[PDB]
Design a protein around this ligand. Structure first.
Ligand SMILES: *Cc1c(COP(=O)(O)O)cnc(C)c1O
Ligand SMILES: *Cc1c(COP(=O)(O)O)cnc(C)c1O
Ligand SMILES: *Cc1c(COP(=O)(O)O)cnc(C)c1O
Ligand SMILES: *Cc1c(COP(=O)(O)O)cnc(C)c1O
Ligand SMILES: [Mg+2]
Ligand SMILES: [Mg+2]
Ligand SMILES: [Mg+2]
Ligand SMILES: [Mg+2]
Ligand SMILES: [Mg+2]
Ligand SMILES: [Mg+2]
Lengths: 332, 332, 332, 332
């Protein structure tokens, strides 16, 4: 079927499945899984960091990432629309006892440093203790300006703040940048990697940072429930994906801007196109209707005034042609 | 000694102390303290609410209120500069496992209902569960419009959201409206009352609401550590304060409005003036230099590029006239 | 390789892997994964419960269960040596703001109802609010008496307390009782099921209960980070495991009971033997020395003055006979 | 009236009241209260510690004491029947995110060190991180053996554990010991002092420890709501009590063992007598009945199978004679 709801719907490729069934495993609680360790070391090395850790979800990757950075009473400055603030049921505050300090991101997706500075609280018993600055490289598809990344890292060091990046779709950014992962990963103390979305993995996310940081991450992961056993089978896929599915992300990107043009031709009001994501202003009076129309044509989208269409390896251009045709028919 | 730093410096008048030293007391934990109970029933009756609870501080009155309103994982929309979000060291999140959703307040001190609406979370496992809208009347002196208070009240009912008002200086707004307290508390499910501010009490606050709500608040006040014993001694100052110090707040207002013209007609840059508060932009170069010049003449003002002068019952106009002069002498 | 450390080392059989590699999957967050849903409905139906939820680990199945049962400030009575109190880094309190009330378990593994009763808190603001009684069937191998399970069930209803059972090895007790799973799950409101232990799955657990309870558990599983995507691949091993690996647990039991006689009739001090678990008091002087002697011959046993040997599908009797010999050779 | 429910019902003496109305005050949030500072320095000096802090309640003193000692995920070993575990609505876990590890106290009221050692968790991700050992000198009236205090302190230093003592009635212990406060205070890193119970204060408790510890206590107190303003009026009483009400505690003690004898003569089954507390095994079938009988004779006690009678300065021996007579009449 044609699914444009999220790149999270990506299913295992033939090659990936065999890599998995082939991978050697062990008990990762003891650290005896060759594959988990191999994936963790690859990411670490690939990003220029000391150590990495495998978690069940990107949600748990960020929760653990936040608990690891901030103690009870500390606070993190994040985007009002960032994932580890808005889309993680408020875990950091509810579970971690961390005060969140959200601020609106700028149009390009960055967090205005002048605003971040204004939110750093003085060492007064009145306020929470600002500790972390969280970013999200690839925010609703937008790739942060490389210069800004350098600026934030520099900014944080000057203010003694830790810097963490939600790299759910960090490889989309990499491919869009045209550089290596380590070249953007140098500007953050820690960052996450989701294997389950664009890279085509069934389950999996990674938190990468220095040795000590990750050791604290290990205690938190166990507590939050991520301490799995024979994760080797899952990690195997993650290794295969990092060595065979990063480059093709460019194919998704061209499909996004290709589709963006088709919908423009058809008459749909396209709001913007960034990486594997495009947004259309469908409208309130056409939301649910378009949903059904499509859903009928075996096309799955998230019905809404502003529909977010996401691309991935399980959607071809030909299939996009179909949806662009079905859409054109909708509007006229 | 001339303290324009805050209205929190007000000291007990001899009549207040006597009222305290001659009050009958009992074990409040056992609910055997006459004066405490008397103070509560009086606040409840005067505001149209069923019950009331006395607490050590407003900070605790709000932490308790927030805990009594939101279960673990629940959320409260508030102002980025509001007290129960910014000035209570993130208590609601750190201790109460409550997710805070702060937004910028409009110029007049209100939380734009349109902005508030966009922040109400869809009922999806993705988000925290929006449950409370917490206001602040008298917000840095600013008196919230009355039509907004009625509109927020209606908005929250149609959204099934509770409405709480941090009334640390509610009586200041009350005198400014020229109405009864009941006429504004009718637009909220719960509100607080600090007696230790302009009303001149040594310490103590009140949280008022529905009988069942307050019953829960009693469990939280205990856990947080506010369940005192013979606190009727303190509650006594409260009654005395509520029966004699409400009307004279108009005197503080006139003085602030007075000082404003004097400082203005003296070379000072008066940004704005609301109730017992005045704001003068002094700037870097003269900030710290101003604090010292004053500190010497016994005039205490929180130095800063933008100084906040707070009038209260312990600062006379004559004394203000003096400071004024001392400020017109600062420029030369 | 001979791992008697835990039954958590069980590795996937080729038939299990195939079942996993050929399973249809979908986005579980969207509830679109056939196998995951299939696995849940099967566990629910087989236990007499309305709903079921798949999780990354048992540790998370219990944290979620506890959170779904107790609101902030609520409490759960448990065993001092129980898993959701002792071996999950205090998660219920640290992350869930739940007060734990642990008590020593009787010799047979049960929590003495008389002791439990004394621990139920009076409804007074002095105490936490007792709400759950959490058991553990198979408790270090010990099979809880059936009359106690029925008695705890009745006790909790007459006290209006929920009853949860940590069933990490529930099927081990089940085979030992010689009854159906439904006949014991009928005595609890919720229970867990680990598939990654004796049942031989690579990872995964289940929490089962009433439809409304489980709906809440879904919100908590997300927040804690267990809301995976195409997890049907994992859920597949679970179904395969539940349809083929339950009965053969009797083989582990016989082997443990077998090894016990061998080690006993060899000079070893066998304290006790329950289901797939055996305990031998080795003592200080021979503890670490034993671990090394074994470690060399590839036999892995958690060294300690009191060694805990765990049998499972990946350790044959023939292999046990070998270890045995290697142990009778340790004394000389 | 005659109140034997608790020494918390103690009311202000003429001398105390005048000391209060006389005391000079200020804003303690800024630290400008002469009296609060004077009380804090007196306690500190009197106990041989660096600094002290004034809180509204003993409950908040312990909560703050626990938050100050243990970070999120750390754990404290305390008595199953200790106040900061059982009688503080579980604040440490609910609010502080601290895992509690309670164990039964021995008959003399101490925590068997052999048990404490058994509960210290290894540095493994399975367990919470043992950090603090909490004691309660004067536990239900029992005075801990001095030798044991020395032992626990020594024990904790050897194990790198912090030691805290709930000194709600620490002065009862002092008077019973016959030594100075500093001689028992040397065996703890921190300890609390309740001014509101036996010492005859209306409100008030103190936490005493080293400079850094108390500084952390200050941030926590503010967050939990204890940061009061003109606390001078309350502190004044606390100073008067520490200089005029410690010695007479002996009068309460003799009244307790005097009354214990009278009740024995009358026929009541006295369980034990320690300091200002005695326990009678009234029985279930006579609980409520005795309550009314007494309550009628204007005598207030906590009705129960085992009645706890507490002495204090507001109950004279003559009044005890009355109650012992009313009791005798009850039984015969
Ligand atoms: C989806 C997502 C996450 C979390 O991953 P889940 O698999 O949904 O838990 C974190 N950050 C971003 C930016 C995401 O898009
Ligand atoms: C001062 C104040 C509080 C709380 O008072 P504390 O005594 O500092 O705890 C709450 N809200 C507002 C708006 C205040 O100005
Ligand atoms: C192993 C186990 C758990 C949880 O399993 P993890 O995979 O370690 O999270 C829960 N309860 C018992 C009794 C166990 O033995
Ligand atoms: C009463 C008491 C406390 C707490 O004091 P409150 O005034 O009740 O908050 C702490 N410890 C002991 C041993 C007590 O008896
Ligand atoms: Mg996928
Ligand atoms: Mg919390
Ligand atoms: Mg005051
Ligand atoms: Mg396994
Ligand atoms: Mg008292
Ligand atoms: Mg907590």
């Amino acid at each position: 079927m044609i699914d444009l709801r999220s790149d999270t719907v990506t299913r295992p490729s033939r090659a990936m499945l065999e890599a998995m069934m082939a991978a050697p495993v062990g008990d990762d609680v003891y650290g005896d899984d060759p594959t988990v360790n191999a994936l963790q070391d690859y990411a670490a090395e690939l990003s220029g960091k000391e150590a990495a850790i495998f978690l069940p979800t990107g949600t748990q990757a960020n929760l653990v990432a936040l608990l690891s950075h901030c103690e009870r009473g500390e606070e993190y400055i994040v985007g009002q629309a960032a994932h580890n603030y808005l889309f993680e049921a408020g875990g950091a505050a509810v579970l971690g006892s961390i005060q969140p300090q959200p601020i609106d991101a700028a149009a390009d997706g960055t967090l205005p440093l002048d605003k971040v500075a204004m939110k750093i609280k003085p060492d007064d018993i009145h306020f929470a203790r600002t500790k972390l600055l969280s970013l999200e490289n690839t925010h609703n598809g937008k790739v942060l300006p490389r210069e800004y990344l350098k600026e934030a890292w520099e900014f944080t060091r000057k203010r003694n703040l830790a810097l963490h990046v939600d790299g759910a779709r960090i490889f989309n950014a990499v491919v869009a940048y045209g550089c290596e992962l380590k070249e953007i990963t140098q500007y953050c103390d820690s960052f996450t990697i989701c294997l389950s979305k664009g890279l085509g993995t069934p389950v999996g996310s990674l938190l990468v940072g220095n040795r000590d940081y990750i050791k604290r991450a290990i205690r938190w992961r166990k507590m939050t429930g991520g301490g799995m056993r024979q994760s080797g089978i899952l990690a195997a896929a993650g290794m295969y994906a990092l060595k065979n599915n990063v480059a093709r992300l460019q194919e998704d990107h061209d499909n996004t801007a290709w589709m963006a043009e088709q919908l423009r031709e058809a008459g749909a009001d396209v709001m913007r196109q960034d990486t594997n994501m495009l947004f259309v202003r469908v409208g309130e009076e056409n939301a649910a209707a378009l949903g059904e129309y499509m859903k009928a044509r075996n096309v799955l989208i998230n019905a809404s005034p502003i529909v977010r269409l996401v691309t991935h390896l399980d959607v071809s251009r030909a299939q996009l042609a179909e949806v662009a045709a079905h859409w054109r028919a909708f509007l006229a």
